[PDB]
Ligand binder design. Structure first.
Ligand code: GTP
Ligand code: ACP
Ligand code: GDP
Ligand code: 94U
Ligand code: CA
Ligand code: MG
Ligand code: MG
Ligand code: NA
Lengths: 54, 437, 427, 334
């Protein structure tokens, strides 16, 4: 029904039609996370090399 | 004028990026060597297409884009592609070994070794911006890179570009076009980590794109090339307002304003029509009413679901071609009398319409036929939560047996992050429900 | 993304030699090492298995290992004998006498460093090594004992590299000695720990196929190896040729192995063919699919109906309706969904390559991660216990320094592996 | 050789159906959680429609229409009829009803009530049955649930011999093409003890539920009269047929209700398809005017008609989609 916000130009036009009305982590926190996962890859790898050493 | 930087992550992101920038060039009359005879302001400008292109004194128009992949084979085809001259070497970043469809490997292991490099190369573009709006990030949910490294990148961009918006074009996993099994893990994991770092995300289910290519383009078995050229048309429709003159969705901030009331619920459903085969000899051109009515057929949606059994929070209609406001209102009036369109009580039942008189440009020798008028509807409906339900169910089936989990744990990730991510998705599904019923 | 190949022992070198013979033909490489093909798809992924030697020639990234010179002398005088790098021939003289201990602890220990020097020289040349592969038997001494020793030491020096094996299982139907169950049980213990993928090639199955199906009165090792080389060519097809499948060994492993220890695969192939006896009637896609899922084409003598598939992979080769391929693949699952676990969605994947193998205009290679594989280990365990309960033939091993405890341990780990497979068969 | 699953074993109707399917030897039953099915006999609560039609190479079908609850629940039914122009507030075959929420449309119900004070105009309502609002709206605050208040039909058609009340049950099957099939065999769930219009506390003679009465079995076996007898009664007693006096109205109401919600629940162009069996409950006043009482989304059948009906479901709703290697239904055309 009600057309509003009609704006026209050479490339086209835009409008709005209403029918009814209504009724982050820090840089250090990130790099601690990444490094906390790196140390665990190294622990797992260490226990592997230890196991292979036995 | 405010600039926009496009980031393509992983195989899917890169190859879709190619399809999009290919199309952009054809629309803006830019040539493979980066020349644009239309532009008279040599070496710079304040135009709308400059949102996606910067200019060199030599008259070359280069995409404000960066391609990143942890394995070089896909981006290598860009380096030696038809649009090789278009890009700058530093815009194309390649690793040595991919993430092997492992989120943890892309995020933690390999991601840590390349994240600083990528941000540096992104900063080189941001420095050439007088007023950077934000970023458009293309990636897959399924890939280890597309999921893993993207979530890490999205986190860092929220630290190094706090005030800037970030939009997503995400490829939702489909077994039809996937040799991977762990995709449900990667999707839940990257959604969880990225959710509060993304202002508006457009999901595309390969399932939907696949069947559209079979049903409407008569392609027996769609390749990625078929899928991407169709996807690029949708993306073009969504970004056209950022690259052309207009008053609807002129910046990234307006996408959040017009489509996303609630921050977490920022996954608008896209619906596109008409999709017509170029090999179709005789074709009766469709009217505004016919193509608009097609925006409410599930068979045309980027994600298969049933909006009838949900509630709308917003709805934008983006036309390209021979369209006038008159025929649109006439179409809307008719469609509502015959279709189920429920808006949440705290929203107005209406449509924000945008029209661009230039019809949809088609890739020469492509699968799509040229049409006199086309439309892309962006409706934020709670019905898209069906895609989360499917995904989360697949997740629960595998994780109950801890299947494949050892691959992730072996890369430094905690088994707890699985349950954390799944809890977030459970909350999200319930948020959709509170709004939806 | 390069792969380093290793072949140890009589069996390992003989199937390895034929493997190189087959793929060298597929990639158009002649015995001299010169390319002579028509397509260029034969080359844009040839770096995986071949080093581009000087003088415009391709040299296999292969290392030949043995504790006696006998078999390796045969390779060197074989059809594609010259193709291999002469420096990559690493051999001892004493032999292993079908003794796992000799290969793993004494005779092999003396030679293993020499082999690793060659592995190193090859690896350092790789732009980005994607993994190792080993061909060997588990029933002998060298391939079995020294092979698992090599694997252990490669994992030590390259702990973040993929390590897979093509392992020939022993069977009384095709037996060299009585101690094969001992050597096999000891080797499986190793493979469960230090490999990502093991393709179980059962000599029982290879024999049955040659006899029952192929109608060969008395099959030889050569006949048995026609099936192995064809299967190996099949599973490596998507690695060796370009396609929409962009995956290395690690990515393939991730999607196929849900649990680290349960990585023992049932290979399959269709159509089954006798060597020399060529095919005139090309199989329809329905026929390829039906055969590769049938037990009669399985290279591991296991009945998949006695278990459930965790994951399945199927590589079709040749020009065919990929639509029809899907419809037929989607048909098998939807017909027998009881034999596929329901808690791994979409666990059956497919790929197509345009280039078929020689002799066949289209084929299909089957890779199944089934719990039915436990029947294989059960069989070896029975044969093992039958002798071990009386400590029979154990003096060959204790003489090399081994203790009975190590046998008891090896026995226990394999019985655990069996119970593990049984766990998920009931899920 | 198709496959199916069962996720509601309390379903007497589809328990019979699952059995009949297996007997054809062209259908195999899978487990509850196996997604690779062609057919799904789903649950009554929170059926996962969102996970249907996403299995490649599988035509999936389900025995429930998503959104059909809006018709098969009393609160929703009243809302549906009043707000829908197709049916409207001027609905002739639906008793005037109002939605009441515990401590909404309550002050509106009084408007009609304040006029009922005229006297000489029957005034009894049901949730139970009473003649005044005070006690009516006093117990609907005592359970805690959302209840509907509806005008009680004080002059029902009464069967002879007995002076008994009765309600009619019609079974309607809607296939995947949204063809509406009325089962030719219905049933009268009758009263055994005479209808007493004096006071309405004794609800044995007013509520004609098969369970409440379990003078049971005096006239008809199981307190269930079928169309052949009931038709004969109308011919002998009232000089008319069942088809003319009642069934045309029944067919009209069934067709009107389903056509109204068709655009809301149709699976015509969906990625999965649906059918569903409905149970319409009707009521006839002394002037042979049919009234709609309610709609059942998960109806049970009469013992005699189980075999015939369930076989019908397999024929037109299942085999129509999944074929195998004069009709008991009346197609309501539109
Ligand atoms: N639509 C579309 N989807 C793609 C394309 N390429 C890959 N995909 C999807 O992406 C998912 C797999 O992730 P990829 O993008 O291939 O992998 P990645 O992002 O490079 O991450 P890696 O694991 O490191 O390789 C699958 O579900 C594919 O269907 C593409 O070109 N178009
Ligand atoms: N407005 C009305 N006037 C007269 N009788 C009515 C009535 N509403 C209901 N009834 C009587 O009350 C009985 C029960 O009503 P109702 O249909 O609500 O119960 P119900 O929940 O059992 C339906 P079903 O068992 O089929 O699911 C009906 O059999 C009918 O006899
Ligand atoms: N398929 C196949 N199996 C073999 C071959 N040679 C030996 N075997 C098997 O391997 C076992 C003997 O191992 P072998 O390779 O001879 O021991 P090694 O040389 O000391 O490593 C026996 O169980 C044989 O059945 C062969 O050429 N092909
Ligand atoms: C992921 C599903 N598919 C079919 C789409 C598939 C395809 C190929 C393989 N191949 C291998 O895993 C392998 C080849 C060699 S050579 C030495 N080790 C290996 N391992 C597995 C699965
Ligand atoms: Ca300019
Ligand atoms: Mg990749
Ligand atoms: Mg030997
Ligand atoms: Na050394």
């Amino acid at each position: 029904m009600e057309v509003i916000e009609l704006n026209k130009c050479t490339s086209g036009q835009s409008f709005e039609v209403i029918l009814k009305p209504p009724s982050d982590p820090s840089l250090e926190e990130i790099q601690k996370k990444l490094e906390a996962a790196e140390e665990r890859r190294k622990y797992q790898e260490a226990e592997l090399l230890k196991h292979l050493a036995e | 004028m405010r600039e926009c930087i496009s980031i393509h992550v992983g195989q899917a992101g890169v190859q879709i990026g190619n399809a999009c920038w290919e199309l952009y060039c054809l629309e803006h009359g830019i040539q493979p060597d980066g020349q644009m005879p239309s532009d008279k302001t040599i070496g710079g400008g304040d135009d709308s297409f400059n949102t996606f292109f910067s200019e060199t004194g030599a008259g070359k128009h280069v995409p404000r884009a960066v391609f990143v992949d942890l394995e070089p084979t896909v981006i290598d085809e860009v380096r030696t592609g038809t649009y090789r001259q278009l890009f700058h070497p530093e815009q194309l970043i390649t690793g040595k070994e991919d993430a092997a469809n492992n989120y943890a490997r892309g995020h933690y292991t390999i991601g840590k070794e390349i994240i600083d490099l990528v941000l540096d190369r992104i900063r080189k573009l941001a420095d050439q911006c007088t007023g950077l709006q934000g970023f458009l990030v293309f990636h897959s949910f399924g890939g280890g890179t597309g999921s893993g490294f993207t979530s890490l990148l999205m986190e860092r961009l929220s630290v190094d570009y706090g005030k800037k918006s970030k939009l997503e074009f995400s490829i939702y996993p489909a077994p039809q076009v996937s040799t991977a099994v762990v995709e449900p893990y990667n999707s839940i994991l990257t959604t969880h980590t990225t959710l509060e770092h993304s202002d508006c995300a457009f999901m595309v289910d390969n399932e939907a794109i696949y069947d559209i290519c079979r049903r409407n383009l008569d392609i027996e078995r769609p390749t990625y090339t078929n899928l991407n050229r169709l996807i690029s048309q949708i993306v073009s429709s969504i970004t056209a307002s950022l690259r052309f003159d207009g008053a609807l969705n002129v910046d990234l901030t307006e996408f959040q304003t017009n489509l996303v009331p609630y921050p977490r619920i920022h996954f608008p459903l896209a619906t596109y029509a008409p999709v017509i085969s170029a090999e179709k000899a005789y074709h009766e051109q469709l009217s505004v009413a016919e193509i608009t009515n097609a925006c409410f057929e599930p068979a045309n949606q980027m994600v298969k679901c049933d909006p009838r059994h949900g509630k709308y929070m917003a709805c934008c209609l983006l036309y390209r071609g021979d369209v006038v406001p008159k025929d649109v209102n006439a179409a809307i009036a008719t469609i509502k009398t015959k279709r189920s369109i429920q808006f949440v009580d705290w929203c107005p039942t209406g449509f924000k319409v945008g029209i661009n008189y230039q019809p949809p440009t088609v890739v020469p020798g492509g699968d799509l036929a040229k049409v006199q008028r086309a439309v892309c509807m962006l409706s934020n409906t709670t019905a898209i939560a069906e895609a989360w339900a499917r995904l989360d169910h697949k997740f629960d089936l595998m994780y109950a047996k801890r299947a494949f989990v050892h691959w992730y744990v072996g890369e430094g990730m905690e088994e707890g992050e699985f349950s954390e991510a799944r809890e977030d998705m459970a909350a999200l599904e319930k948020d959709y429900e509170e709004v939806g019923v | 993304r390069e792969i380093v190949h290793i072949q140890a022992g009589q069996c390992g070198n003989q199937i390895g030699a034929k493997f190189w013979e087959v793929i060298s033909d597929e990639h158009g490489i002649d015995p001299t090492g010169s390319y002579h093909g028509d397509s260029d798809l034969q080359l844009e992924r040839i770096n995986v298995y071949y080093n581009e030697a000087t003088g415009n020639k391709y040299v296999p990234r292969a290392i030949l290992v043995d504790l006696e010179p006998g078999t390796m002398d045969s390779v060197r005088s074989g059809p594609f004998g010259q193709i291999f790098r002469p420096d990559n021939f690493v051999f001892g003289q004493s032999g292993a006498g079908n003794n796992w201990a000799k290969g793993h602890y004494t005779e092999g220990a003396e030679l293993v460093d020499s082999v690793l020097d060659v592995v190193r020289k090859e690896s350092e040349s790789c732009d980005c090594l994607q993994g190792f592969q080993l061909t060997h038997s588990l029933g002998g001494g060298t391939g079995s004992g020294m092979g698992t020793l090599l694997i252990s030491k490669i994992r030590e020096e390259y702990p973040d590299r993929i390590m897979n094996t093509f392992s020939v299982m022993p069977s009384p139907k095709v037996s060299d000695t009585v101690v094969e169950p001992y050597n096999a049980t000891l080797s499986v213990h190793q493979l469960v720990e230090n490999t990502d993928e093991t393709y179980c090639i059962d000599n029982e199955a290879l024999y049955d196929i040659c006899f029952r199906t192929l109608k060969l009165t008395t099959p030889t090792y050569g006949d048995l190896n026609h099936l192995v080389s064809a299967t190996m060519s099949g599973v490596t097809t998507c690695l060796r040729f370009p396609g929409q499948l962009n995956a290395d060994l690690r990515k393939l492993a991730v999607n196929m192995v849900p649990f680290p220890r349960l990585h023992f695969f049932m290979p399959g192939f269709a159509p089954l063919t006798s060597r020399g006896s060529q095919q005139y009637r090309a199989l329809t896609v329905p026929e390829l699919t039906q055969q590769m899922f049938d037990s009669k084409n399985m290279m591991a003598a296991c009945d998949p109906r006695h278990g459930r598939y965790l994951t399945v992979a199927a590589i079709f080769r040749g020009r065919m309706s990929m639509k029809e391929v899907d419809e037929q693949m989607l048909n098998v699952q939807n017909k027998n969904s009881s034999y596929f676990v329901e808690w791994i969605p979409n666990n059956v994947k497919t790929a197509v390559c345009d280039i078929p193998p020689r002799g066949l205009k289209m084929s299909a290679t089957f890779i199944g991660n089934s719990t039915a594989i436990q029947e294989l280990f059960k069989r070896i365990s029975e044969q093992f216990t039958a002798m071990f309960r009386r400590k029979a033939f154990l003096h060959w091993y204790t003489g090399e320094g081994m203790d009975e405890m190590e046998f008891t341990e090896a026995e226990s780990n394999m019985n655990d592996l069996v119970s593990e497979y049984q766990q998920y068969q009931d899920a | 050789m198709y496959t199916f699953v069962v996720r509601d074993e309390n379903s007497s109707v589809y328990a019979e159906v699952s059995r009949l399917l297996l007997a054809t030897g062209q259908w195999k039953r899978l487990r509850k959680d196996n997604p690779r099915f062609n057919l799904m006999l789903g649950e009554r609560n929170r059926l996962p429609f969102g996970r249907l039609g996403h299995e490649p190479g599988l035509v999936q079908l389900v025995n429930y229409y998503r959104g059909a609850d809006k018709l098969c629940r009393k609160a929703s039914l009243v809302k549906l009829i009043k707000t829908s122009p197709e049916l409207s507030e001027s609905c002739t075959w639906f008793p005037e009803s109002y939605v009441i929420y515990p401590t909404d449309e309550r002050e509106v119900f009084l408007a009609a009530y304040n006029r009922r004070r005229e006297g000489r105009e029957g005034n009894v309502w049901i949730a139970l049955i009473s003649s005044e609002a005070s006690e009516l709206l006093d117990f609907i605050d005592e359970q805690g649930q959302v209840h509907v208040i509806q005008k009680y039909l004080e002059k029902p058609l009464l069967l002879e011999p007995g002076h008994r009340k009765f309600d009619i049950r019609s079974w309607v099957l809607v296939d995947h093409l949204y063809n509406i099939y009325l089962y030719r065999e219905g049933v009268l769930r009758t009263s055994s003890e005479p209808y007493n219009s004096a006071n309405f506390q004794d609800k044995t003679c007013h509520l004609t539920n098969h369970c409440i009465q379990k003078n049971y079995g005096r006239y008809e076996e199981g307190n269930e009269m079928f169309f052949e007898e009931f038709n004969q009664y109308l011919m002998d007693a009232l000089n008319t047929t069942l088809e003319n006096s009642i069934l045309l109205q029944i067919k009209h109401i069934i067709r009107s209700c389903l056509m109204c919600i068709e655009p809301a629940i149709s699976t015509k162009h969906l990625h999965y398809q649906s059918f569903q069996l409905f149970g319409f409950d009707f009521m006839v006043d002394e002037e042979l005017k049919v009234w709609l009482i309610e709609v059942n989304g998960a109806p049970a059948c009469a013992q005699k008609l189980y075999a015939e009906l369930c076989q019908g479901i397999v024929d037109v709703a299942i085999s129509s989609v999944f074929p195998l290697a004069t009709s008991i239904f009346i197609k309501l055309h539109h």
